[PDB]
């Protein structure tokens, strides 16, 4: 399941430390564009374009991410047949043109794929977070949004704890014993939750605030350097995209 | 001369319930290592939690240098920034998504601007021996690490005194031992050190003076010498001694004549 | 069960995002006068926020071979209120996407518009009629997460009908086929944690 | 011979972290073993993977000398450090019987094998405990009773007296000694070692990822040297003793005082 392995790696290689301000453009761009380029001649080359930033930009180690990555591939599989199909009143048949339109499908999310891949890769979901400061959200629902990121891996801890518990002691020998088990880890995951929340609040009214939240961050300013080279070829891309 | 924080009574319970904090008004002398003692259920997690103003007593006043502050609201706001605390569980004043992302919520909220309040921050990092450790998350962070964390947010205000909550849980007398550095380093700087703890030996290896109590009022605090060691004095709460010298009958930092 | 990358056409991405938007902003302006209210709201509702996603990524026995993590959109319903989760929901989605990969970024409020808008309306009328159906707590919490995450997987086929019609049979076309490739999958699972969701509102009163 | 062995075990975390890097180890019957070390060293992760919670990436146990396991779990059990995640259920029977009951054990046989569990761990009644309304102790006492309630060969358990007091660590300390009497194999982590001279007779250093020494339970806590490379000190006097030797006369060292007199 749980994906303590996705938030490390994106805060431990070569590219974590480098602005989120065009790391969130490299990705935020090309993923726009591979939703609206038109696909054959584009979602082509900005795969390669995003995997060579994945891959060569910012090494990582996978390499490895298709264990991440693979996990859509099973449900676009079926997405794709559906295209391929059917209907009318016939029993029966493939479409016209059933594999231009599926393979069209594939090159497009897969492309986009790989935009949230390199994003979720070398961005850590906290930073993603912040960034929203310079546009609309206000301030509240990102000081939230950061702390439900911070109880998740507060809570995922004593959660792997107990699963782990009545795996001993034998969680597992039926299967809706599984079932009922697992209850048993969610039921108990709301009450200590909420007292989680509560000896926060204590907790941090040592500073002489407990709620607001204002933070330092320590991100550095992406020089509109990489700013103007990217945005170019990003949109380079995009006109021989749309060529 | 006057203490820097003296508690009244200073009193306390569960509504409906049993007792809380009775009336112990122990007085610290600015510049010391208190250290508040018992294995609990006498309260000393919420004994220190009056001495910051998270909890207001049914009846005690503490009074912060010389006179009493006034809590209920507003002016706790000035008793924190004097006064600090370090909860047992580091899960508990940490949400503090990167570690510099933490301790800088300290001088932030405590007046101060963006440039000023970073460099107090690194100050801290380094007063804790985590410079290295600033901007890597903090549930990947090994739990004694996190305290460090959670004290370096403390410290990175400049309080007086800093009172701390078993801040010896769970290490390791490797990370324990180059704990006490950093905080011996902290009263030698000048900080008023008070802290609840029940393995017995730390206090005899940070403490000044010790407090004793069970029930709820303190019973004992002098010296750790001659608390450390009037076993007796030790008997009436469950403990004893640190390992020392078993007889002076001739004629806590390792010494030895032999 | 939810749509992944830029499997949604950017008419359509931005055509459910705008019809998210409306109830998005709903819950974020309570969400904005709770925390006026009792500021410490930030700490309750971001703990309610990282419940539902840590629930959904456990995992849960299906009805059949399968074995899916779970959808917490019948239990966060009986819990927590349905307009609070119109905007956790979709801060739960992003974490699903940025973290399990298995969200997208461009389909985040069509999917909010199904998993934290649909489903969670719906889950309620359920749950409140069955209470007012007579029906036993018991079974008015199972039909909740049940029929309440049949809500997601018709919304869901109903979007990708919409930006998929037929080839053949225009627009139900994809629809019943959606609705039929997408519907051995999730009716083992709208099944078992409709039961799971049991056990669980079990165990909270008693606890 | 081995009830417990490890292959070069190989397990690391992210790309990889590597917690565990290509360490053999072994655990004899009827013993008390003590896998010393620095705190964050994930020694749990060995643990885990003893009792099949993990499996590594080149991984090797074994039973009775040889490598489905509701056998496995069966034959040794597990109690993780923090209690509360382990204990689940209502009052403190329900916790006992539920293990045993999660075995096929008929409400008689779990009847009666809760019977020792409570016993031999000293718990008594009444009984309650229930799902919580102490402080921490006590819940040691009954997730360790729920270990033992399962026909176990081995035990495994980290540490065994994190946030505990002294009293509280001497009693848990007596209880273990006596498990050890009912000729259990029990398999223990820990910070403190004053707490594996307390317990062990073996002991295996553990740095990095990998067991650089073991089998002696005096031996690793008198080759002062070896403790140094893991940064930890031999126990109070034994490494007194050992300095008290140095200039005292000294053959034998014996924890109440030995001191030599006059006059």
Redesign the interface.
Known sequence: ???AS??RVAAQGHWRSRPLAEKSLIG?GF?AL???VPPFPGAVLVTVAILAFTFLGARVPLRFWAS??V??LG??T??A???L????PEGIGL??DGPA?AAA?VM??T???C???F??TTTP?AD??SGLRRWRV?A??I???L??????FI??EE?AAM?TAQRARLGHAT??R???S??????????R??T???R??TGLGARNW????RVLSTRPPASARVLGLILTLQAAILAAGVL | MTPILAAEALTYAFPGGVKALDDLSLAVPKGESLAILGPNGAGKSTLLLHLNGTLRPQSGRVLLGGTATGHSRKDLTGWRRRVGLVLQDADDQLFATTVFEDVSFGPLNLGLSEAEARARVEEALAALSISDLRDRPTHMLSGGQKRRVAIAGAVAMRPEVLLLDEPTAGLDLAGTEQLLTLLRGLRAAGMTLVFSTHDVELAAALADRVALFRTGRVLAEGAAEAVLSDRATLAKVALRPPLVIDLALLAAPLPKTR | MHI???????TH?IGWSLAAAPFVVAG?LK??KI?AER??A??????????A???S?????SVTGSCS??TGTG?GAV?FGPSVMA??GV??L??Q??????G???TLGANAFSMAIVGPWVAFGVYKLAGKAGASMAVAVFLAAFLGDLATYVTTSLQ?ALA?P????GFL??A???GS??ALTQIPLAI?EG??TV??????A??
Do not use: N
């Open positions: 399941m749980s994906i996705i938030d935020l993923l591979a939703v609206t991440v990555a996990l859509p449900f676009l079926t997405g047949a559906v295209l199909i059917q209907i009318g479409a016209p339109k499908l497009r999310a492309a986009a794929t935009c949230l891949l994003l979720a979901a993603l977070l206000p509240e629902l000081e939230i949004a702390l439900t990121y911070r109880f998740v809570l995922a959660a699963t299967r809706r599984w079932l009922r697992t209850a048993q880890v969610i039921a108990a995951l709301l009450p939750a909420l989680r929340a509560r926060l609040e407990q709620g607001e939240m | 992944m990358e830029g499997y949604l056409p950017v991405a974020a969400i904005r925390v500021p410490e930030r700490m309750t509702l971001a703990a309610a926020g990282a419940f996603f840590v629930l990524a456990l995992k849960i026995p993590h779970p239990l819990v905007v956790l801060i739960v992003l974490f996407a940025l973290l399990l990969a298995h997208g970024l461009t990708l998929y037929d080839p053949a049979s076309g994809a019943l086929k959606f490739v997408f078992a039961f799971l056990i669980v509102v079990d165990a909270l008693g606890k």
